[PDB]
Design an enzyme around this catalytic site. Structure first.
Site, PDB file in Angstrom:
ATOM      1  N   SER A 147       0.908  -7.252  -1.021  1.00  0.00           N
ATOM      2  CA  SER A 147       1.786  -8.551   0.008  1.00  0.00           C
ATOM      3  C   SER A 147       0.794  -9.718  -0.027  1.00  0.00           C
ATOM      4  O   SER A 147       1.351 -10.740   0.650  1.00  0.00           O
ATOM      5  CB  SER A 147       2.273  -7.935   1.387  1.00  0.00           C
ATOM      6  OG  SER A 147       1.060  -7.718   2.155  1.00  0.00           O
ATOM      7  N   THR A 161       1.416  -4.509   4.307  1.00  0.00           N
ATOM      8  CA  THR A 161       1.170  -4.794   5.387  1.00  0.00           C
ATOM      9  C   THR A 161       0.541  -6.093   5.891  1.00  0.00           C
ATOM     10  O   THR A 161       0.835  -6.760   6.859  1.00  0.00           O
ATOM     11  CB  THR A 161       0.464  -3.854   6.387  1.00  0.00           C
ATOM     12  OG1 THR A 161      -0.701  -3.823   5.939  1.00  0.00           O
ATOM     13  CG2 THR A 161       0.886  -2.214   5.992  1.00  0.00           C
ATOM     14  N   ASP A 162      -0.139  -6.636   4.826  1.00  0.00           N
ATOM     15  CA  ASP A 162      -0.933  -7.813   4.922  1.00  0.00           C
ATOM     16  C   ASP A 162      -0.001  -9.121   5.479  1.00  0.00           C
ATOM     17  O   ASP A 162      -0.234  -9.817   6.025  1.00  0.00           O
ATOM     18  CB  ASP A 162      -1.648  -8.402   3.762  1.00  0.00           C
ATOM     19  CG  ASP A 162      -3.047  -7.699   3.979  1.00  0.00           C
ATOM     20  OD1 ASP A 162      -3.263  -6.728   4.836  1.00  0.00           O
ATOM     21  OD2 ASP A 162      -3.922  -7.852   3.050  1.00  0.00           O
ATOM     22  N   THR A 186       0.775  -1.059   0.132  1.00  0.00           N
ATOM     23  CA  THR A 186       0.141   0.080   0.189  1.00  0.00           C
ATOM     24  C   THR A 186       0.917   1.324   0.001  1.00  0.00           C
ATOM     25  O   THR A 186       0.485   2.336  -0.653  1.00  0.00           O
ATOM     26  CB  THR A 186      -1.129   0.076   1.215  1.00  0.00           C
ATOM     27  OG1 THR A 186      -2.023  -1.023   1.020  1.00  0.00           O
ATOM     28  CG2 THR A 186      -1.494   1.399   1.407  1.00  0.00           C
TER      29      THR A 186
END
Lengths: 182, 128
Positions: free
Chosen positions: A52, A83-84, A11
């Protein structure tokens, strides 16, 4: 002095178009757009530009190899990442790069660096400060905190404070221009 | 990288899917148990299924809760799970538990050896 930034996408680097396309900034463009103008003697390497959620274990092998071939050449390495799966990557790299000679800091952001209220600048500056600390190991920088990478989990899905150190103290926390270790 | 399966323990869960996993070639299984960890000793065939399978593949136990770890010595369901060959994940995060197991399986397939490694603090992930 000498920092390498490795981009994986996420992101933080996201750019979406009204006509529906989804594009991605290289890691150098992320830093520039985030307004980090005091990262001198920084090299940039784009390893991936993916959401991700797409990450698979093969990507960890490629990242680790890339990290291994750079740890002697730099004083610190920062990896920007979606961030996932950030915490899966930081965890696997911790097992793969057993006790590295330098700080390796994974970071990202909940809001694209292109937005004016982004958390990108805070997370990048935290990562940059810690990558110069001389404290070796694999870490995650997020929301002003530095956390042991193999003790980090994503705890929130829609908040700037997305990550926590689980059952282990935070390594360092930002107060002004200072990372405080206690 | 070896294939691992992560299943959340829920009331009434059978050993069915676990056999299927082994039969499919999965090389390790993580169960997210309740609280400090364990396996129901009645009401399902889950514990008996695990007694068998824990000999063929590492079966690792972590918690569905977010904080504090598992401690399978704490309760009968934990001690019976240990007796059945379950490998405890201690205070590791779920991401560390999964990735550690995957990493280990790259080096070995000996379940008792995998069990020593899972229980050893390799890089700061665990209090051993």
């Amino acid at each position: 002095m000498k920092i390498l930034l490795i981009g994986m996408g996420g992101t933080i680097a996201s750019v979406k178009g009204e006509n529906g396309y989804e594009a991605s900034l290289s890691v150098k463009e992320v830093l520039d757009i985030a307004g980090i103008k005091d990262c001198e003697d920084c090299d940039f390497l784009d390893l991936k530009n993916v959401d991700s959620t797409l990450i698979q274990p093969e990507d960890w092998v490629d990242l680790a190899e890339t990290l291994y071939k750079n740890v002697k050449k730099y004083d610190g390495i920062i990896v920007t990442h979606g961030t996932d799966t950030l915490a899966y990557t930081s965890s696997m790299i911790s097992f793969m790069l057993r006790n590295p000679p330098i700080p390796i800091v994974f970071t990202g952001s909940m809001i694209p660096a292109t937005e004016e209220n982004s958390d990108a600048p805070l997370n990048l500056q935290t990562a940059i400060k810690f990558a110069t600390s001389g404290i070796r190991g694999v870490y995650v920088a997020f929301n002003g905190k530095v956390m042991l990478g193999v003790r980090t989990s994503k705890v929130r899905t829609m908040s700037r404070d997305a990550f926590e150190s689980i059952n282990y103290p935070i390594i360092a926390e930002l107060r002004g221009e200072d990372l405080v270790v206690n | 990288h070896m294939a691992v399966l992560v299943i959340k323990l829920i009331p009434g869960l059978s050993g069915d899917i676990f056999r299927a996993a082994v039969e499919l070639g999965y090389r390790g299984i993580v169960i997210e148990g309740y609280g400090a960890g364990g396996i129901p000793y009645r009401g399902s065939d889950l514990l008996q299924t695990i007694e068998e399978l824990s000999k063929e593949i590492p079966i690792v136990m972590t918690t569905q809760a977010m904080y504090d770890g598992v401690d399978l010595t704490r309760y009968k369901v934990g001690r019976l799970a240990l007796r059945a060959g379950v490998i405890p994940a201690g205070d590791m995060t779920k991401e560390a538990t999964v990735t550690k197991l995957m990493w280990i399986l790259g080096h070995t397939n000996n379940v008792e050896e995998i069990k020593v490694l899972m229980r050893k603090n390799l890089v700061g992930e665990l209090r051993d």
